Design a protein around this ligand. Structure first.
Ligand SMILES: CCCCCCCCCCCCCC(=O)SCCNC(=O)CCNC(=O)[C@H](O)C(C)(C)COP(=O)(O)OP(=O)(O)OC[C@H]1O[C@@H](n2cnc3c(N)ncnc32)[C@H](O)[C@@H]1OP(=O)(O)O
Ligand SMILES: O=C(c1cccc(NCc2cc(-c3ccc(Cl)cc3)c[nH]c2=O)c1)N1CCOCC1
Ligand SMILES: [Cl-]
Ligand SMILES: [Mg+2]
Length: 385
């Protein structure tokens, strides 16, 4: 790989190695005045479109583009199917900019063929807190792949983020790019065993028959933490303290305001699930997971796999194993087929005992315009959508 685009950007070369004495931008002393005020040029017949994610019809156009053209596994079995309600939540966090929700239309058809997004957040990297853009949902229509549209989308969102006096970004991808700050494998905990086998995801053998697999993954319908309940507005201050206190140990985390805690955790059916344990007026434990279905490609029976993804989990009255056992149970109670988690924070410590299987690859964490030491994924304290 030559990285002809990426090697023009303020990111590390593949064989760049920085030690912990280095924690700073590649390019400092940036001036909003000097940022390009012209939109990047698109190929003839294509136009920039500012998407209004709060408009049901604009949001439906993003939904359709991602449904048909977003992330697949390397074997083209699954395609991520973020819901329209999920995209509304993901993109309208506190102080979001509409103008960071960037579409490209094909003029002749008036159809959306490209998208990229960012939201603003404070990110703490090796104890330094920096205002950053969190970039996600980069997507080019399958009919227009390998035409160098992605670098146009990346340069245009970089320009718009820079106009807000923001000079760093955080992003994740399954593909290897220059250069990860950390790299986390994903693991899966089967809940609906029979469905996962029927779609070709989970395997059986002469030792693990269907009946034995169903018994292996069977869940007792009783919580270790009896009073775990859906989070309410009254719990925002307590979750801010419990989660905020927990995250300070990590080398990379979001520094959440109380308004960001309310946005990212208060529950929304089929989008975000947060449960809390309240003891003596204090929030002492929390579980959270988001809903991200996958379309099961070419399957006539099942249109989607209903997957819960581990978000943020903290325990002070139970073991981390007991807490994540309760997270699996709460996902089962909410009709999820599988519980997915990355080897970030304390997660890898429970994967063997709670019968998670290792997945087919890894999610890489990246910073834009930041040089620093890389670290093991247990020191990652942030989960992007
Ligand atoms: C200060 C503010 C800064 C803000 C910006 C921060 C950076 C944000 C960066 C974006 C974070 C996004 C986070 C997410 O959303 S990760 C999810 C990405 N989306 C998908 O995987 C959906 C399915 N695939 C697609 O839609 C396309 O394949 C995409 C759009 C991904 C590439 O389109 P296409 O396949 O038609 O290729 P091209 O000819 O246009 O372009 C080829 C160039 O693009 C580089 N490439 C390929 N994949 C990715 C990728 N996932 N991140 C970054 N760069 C990527 C590639 O190495 C090459 O450059 P180089 O190798 O020649 O050098
Ligand atoms: O095998 C997959 C799957 C589905 C789609 C894509 C991929 N691989 C690539 C990939 C991965 C992920 C990913 C997968 C799991 C987790 Cl916990 C966190 C991130 C993100 N971005 C990617 O590009 C893997 N599963 C397991 C069953 O539930 C849906 C996800
Ligand atoms: Cl350029
Ligand atoms: Mg292209």
């Amino acid at each position: 790989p030559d990285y002809k685009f990426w090697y023009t950007q303020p990111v590390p070369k593949i064989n760049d190695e920085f030690n912990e004495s280095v924690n700073e931008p590649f390019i400092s002393d940036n001036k909003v005045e000097d940022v390009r005020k012209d939109e990047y040029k698109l190929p003839p017949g294509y136009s920039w479109y500012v998407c209004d994610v709060k408009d049901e019809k604009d949001r439906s156009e993003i939904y359709t583009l991602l449904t048909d053209n977003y992330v697949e596994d390397d074997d083209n079995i699954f395609r991520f199917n973020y819901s329209a309600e999920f995209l509304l939540w993901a993109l309208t966090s506190p102080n979001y900019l509409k103008t960071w929700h960037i579409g490209v239309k094909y003029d002749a058809s008036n159809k959306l063929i490209g998208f990229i997004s960012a939201i603003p957040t404070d990110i703490c990297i090796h104890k330094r807190t920096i205002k950053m853009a969190e970039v996600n949902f980069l997507c080019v229509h399958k009919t227009l792949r390998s035409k160098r549209l992605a670098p146009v989308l990346i340069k245009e969102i970089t320009r718009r983020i820079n106009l807000e006096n923001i000079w760093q970004a955080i992003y994740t991808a399954g593909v290897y790019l220059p250069k990860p700050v950390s790299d986390a494998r994903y693991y899966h905990r089967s809940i609906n065993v029979k469905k996962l086998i029927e779609i070709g995801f989970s395997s059986l053998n002469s030792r693990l028959t269907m009946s034995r697999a169903i018994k292996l993954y069977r869940v007792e319908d009783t919580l270790n933490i009896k009073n775990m309940r859906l989070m309410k507005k009254k719990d925002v201050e307590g979750v801010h303290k419990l989660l905020g206190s927990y995250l300070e140990q990590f080398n990379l985390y979001a520094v959440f305001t109380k308004e960001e805690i309310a946005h990212w955790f208060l529950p929304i059916e089929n989008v975000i699930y947060t449960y809390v344990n309240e003891e003596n007026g204090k929030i002492k434990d929390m579980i959270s997971f988001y809903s991200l279905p996958s379309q099961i490609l070419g399957n006539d029976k099942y249109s989607t796999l209903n997957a819960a993804y581990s978000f943020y989990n903290v325990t002070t009255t139970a073991t981390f194993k007991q807490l994540m056992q309760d997270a699996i149970l709460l996902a089962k109670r909410n009709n999820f087929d599988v519980f997915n988690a990355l080897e970030v924070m304390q997660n890898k410590s429970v994967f063997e005992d709670l019968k998670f299987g290792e997945g087919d690859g890894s999610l890489k964490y990246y910073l834009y315009n930041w040089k620093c030491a890389s670290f093991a994924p247990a020191h990652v304290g942030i989960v992007l959508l």
